[PDB]
Design a protein around this nucleic acid. Structure first.
Lengths: 178, 94, 116, 79, 136
RNA sequence: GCCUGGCGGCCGUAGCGCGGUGGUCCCACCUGACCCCAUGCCGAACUCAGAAGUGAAACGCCGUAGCGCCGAUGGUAGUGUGGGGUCUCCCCAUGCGAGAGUAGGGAACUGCCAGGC
RNA sequence: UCCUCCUAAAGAGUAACGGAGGAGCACGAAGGUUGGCUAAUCCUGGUCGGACAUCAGGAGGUUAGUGCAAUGGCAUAAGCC
């Protein structure tokens, strides 16, 4: 919990001393992660998530809530009002708080670690930092055996082109590939 | 290039328009040129014997009417429902 | 367009007020301002108003988007309503919520005199 | 084949037509199954279960030309 | 053989012809036919007329057709009395009037519909003939 | 006089596209929030305490007609009322008559009020 | 017997074993009401994933839905929260 201090001091802002931007409303900004955790085939278990109800709030700084389905009959079995996931969305200070663990300590499991490919880039420079499945962070009671679920993370920017959104990769370091 | 004699048309409507076509005549009009629209009477089979040439539509022609003479260009046509004959034609001031 | 959703809520109200005709009180607010105007019984013009634009409020209030500034307009429009003798006045909230600064304005208008 | 029936007796016609007497309440328009093609405007309203734009006060019809494109309203005149 | 798409409804009404309707401007080609008369046209007639042209034109063109069957007709046994009722669909028909062009051509210079039409007119109603392109 | 907002009167010649311009009053973004109010999670939404930073976006202003939109004039389809012709159609006399297209228009109108320069 | 669109004539009921169909019920909620909300479909990407699976973005809209039939309407929503 220190990125909030540095993101206000020079990160993608000292840029404004050499480039033609009179406010942060023309520079790249990051303030959101629309988090989700899926249940998949949980309807054939219906007992584990009945006790793991705060297991997403174990990695996100917001209140846990089960999301209810928008579908009532499906080729994989669903039922009206069945719980289909959990969000626990990150914005502002809780998003900068959450970002301090991404790439820095998220290294317990890897699949490329040199930049993979720029999926979901939106032509703006939207960066991937997902882990495919949870890797477990140091907090309390984390050394034991415990199950883990699917986790993917994209950091989206207010930039107009990846020519100018890349000013973030000129202020931090992480492995990147197109 | 052509020059044709026209007459100001003073009685208008369906039966009068059909009457002309039985009595060697047919209706037409002149508009544009930053001036008001004018109704005219032309020779039915004699202008049909003339308009079947590109030089009637690719270039201006002279109309002699109302005691003067003016150049115009051919703008539109109405043909008979089952014959090539002229029912009504438009001109614009050149 | 979340701006247009407020205008839809105002179309709902404008249509509902159309069958009333008569003298009407319209309240409108923005993140720095608030004002209230009394519309004539022919609908074509204003009679009296109060607005956070007057130096009688704007030089005394440290910010015009404040609750006490909304109350200052409420206490002015109620005072000007008594000057022009208005009764049977139908209220209109310009597509906004009644709760918050429109309620905080109305609460003080019924403190400067008759309800309101 | 046959048996297409349609049944018998239904009307709801011509009551929203021409000059009115201006001394009792009137239906204004009784067009069938009305939900947005017409609606009401001005001092009058009509919310009946049979979609009638019946005015609740005595007056005459305006036969008004105002209203967006093909949406024109039942409204009563000032006299 | 010509067999049009099944009608949405099992049967249709035949309908009256106004005996005029302008349609003389060629849009699938540049020339066509003169109709100048009115009547009923059947699917077997336009296929027999297509055969007459197919035999004289071999494979040149193709030729485009602006007439297509519009109605199926109801037919029943001859002994059924007057009264009840309409039979099943049999033959398909259309209506023709003076302003029709019927058939439209451009890719068949001087070997069809330029000197005569007698060989195809012999398959058709209303004693039809060819037309020359309208250019002014 | 021009500007910015509103109540509107009006809501297909204020629309679609294309090129410029503006932070002053205004507004939008925006500053901050366990404070009023709030998220079925999130200050996103809506609040409340507001001006540190802009005019990015949205918004307003302005140009530009290829067009929606507006659209003559004449003709055509259509036709009331008499009548002609081996006639479920044609032709006429008299009285009416579009829609579509063409010439052409056109980048909104207007009353009241507050403030600005 | 009842009920919609059309025939049915730019005034109305309406014919011929005329044209496309239905109704004898449903829901105590699917009713009342305050404030909100806005489809559908398709594309993009995300472990356990045969296969439609998540949450977010884009295109896009009187094209979703309406207890049931045919029809007319639809955000001032009569459509759902």
């Amino acid at each position: 919990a220190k990125l909030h201090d540095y993101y206000k001091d020079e990160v993608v802002k000292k840029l404004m001393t050499e480039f033609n931007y009179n406010s942060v409303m023309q520079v790249p900004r990051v303030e959101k992660i629309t988090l989700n955790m899926g249940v998949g085939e949980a309807i054939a278990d219906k007992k584990l998530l009945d006790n793991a109800a705060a297991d997403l709030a174990a990695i996100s700084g917001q209140k846990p809530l089960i999301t209810k389905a928008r579908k009532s009959v499906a080729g994989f079995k669903i039922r009206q009002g069945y719980p289909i996931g959990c969000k626990v969305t990150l914005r502002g200070e809780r998003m900068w708080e959450f970002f301090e663990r991404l790439i820095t300590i998220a290294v317990p499991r890897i699949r490329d670690f040199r930049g993979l490919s720029a999926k979901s880039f939106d032509g703006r420079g939207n960066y991937s930092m997902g882990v495919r499945e949870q890797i477990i962070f140091p907090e309390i009671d984390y050394d034991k055996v415990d199950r883990v679920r699917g986790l993917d993370i994209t950091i989206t920017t207010t930039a107009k082109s990846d020519e100018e959104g890349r000013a973030l990769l000129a202020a931090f370091d992480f492995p990147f590939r197109k | 290039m052509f020059t044709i004699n026209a007459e100001v048309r003073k009685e208008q409507g369906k039966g009068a328009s059909r009457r002309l076509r039985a009595a060697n005549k047919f209706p037409a009009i002149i508009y544009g040129g930053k001036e008001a629209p004018l109704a005219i009477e032309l020779d039915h089979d004699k202008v049909m014997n003339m308009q079947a040439k590109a030089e009637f539509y690719s270039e201006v022609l002279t109309i002699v009417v109302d005691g003067k003479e003016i150049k115009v260009k051919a703008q539109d046509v109405q043909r008979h429902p089952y014959k090539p004959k002229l029912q009504h034609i438009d001109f614009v001031r050149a | 367009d979340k701006k247009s959703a407020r205008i839809r809520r105002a179309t709902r109200a404008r249509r509902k007020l159309q069958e009333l005709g008569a003298t009407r009180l319209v309240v409108h607010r923005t993140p720095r301002h608030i004002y209230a105007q009394v519309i004539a019984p022919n609908g074509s013009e204003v009679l009296v108003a109060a607005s956070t634009v007057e130096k009688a409020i704007a030089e005394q209030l440290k910010y015009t988007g404040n609750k006490d500034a909304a109350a200052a307009v409420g206490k002015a429009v109620a005072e000007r309503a008594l000057e022009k003798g208005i009764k049977d006045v139908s209220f209109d909230r310009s597509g906004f919520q009644y709760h918050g600064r429109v309620q905080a304005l109305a609460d003080a208008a019924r403190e400067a005199g008759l309800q309101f | 084949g046959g048996s297409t029936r349609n049944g018998r007796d239904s009307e709801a016609k011509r009551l929203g037509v021409k000059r009115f007497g201006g001394e009792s309440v009137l239906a204004g328009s009784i067009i069938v199954r009305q939900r947005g093609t017409k609606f009401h405007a001005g001092a009058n309203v009509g919310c009946g279960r049979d979609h009638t734009l019946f005015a609740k006060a005595d007056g005459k019809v305006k036969f008004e030309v105002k209203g967006p494109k093909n949406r024109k309203f039942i409204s009563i005149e000032a006299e | 053989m010509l067999q049009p798409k099944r009608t949405k409804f099992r049967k249709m009404h035949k309908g009256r012809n106004r005996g005029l309707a302008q349609g003389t401007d060629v849009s699938f080609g540049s020339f066509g036919l003169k109709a100048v008369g009115r009547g009923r046209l059947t699917a077997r007639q336009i296929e027999a007329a297509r055969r007459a042209m197919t035999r004289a034109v071999k494979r040149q063109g193709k030729i485009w057709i602006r007439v297509f069957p519009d109605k199926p007709i109801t037919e029943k046994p001859l002994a059924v009395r007057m009264g009840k009722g309409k039979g099943n669909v049999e033959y398909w028909v259309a209506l023709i009037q003076p302003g029709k062009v019927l058939y439209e051509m451009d890719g068949v210079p001087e070997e069809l519909a330029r000197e005569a039409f007698k060989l195809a007119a012999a398959k058709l109603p209303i004693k039809t003939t060819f037309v020359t392109k309208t250019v002014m």
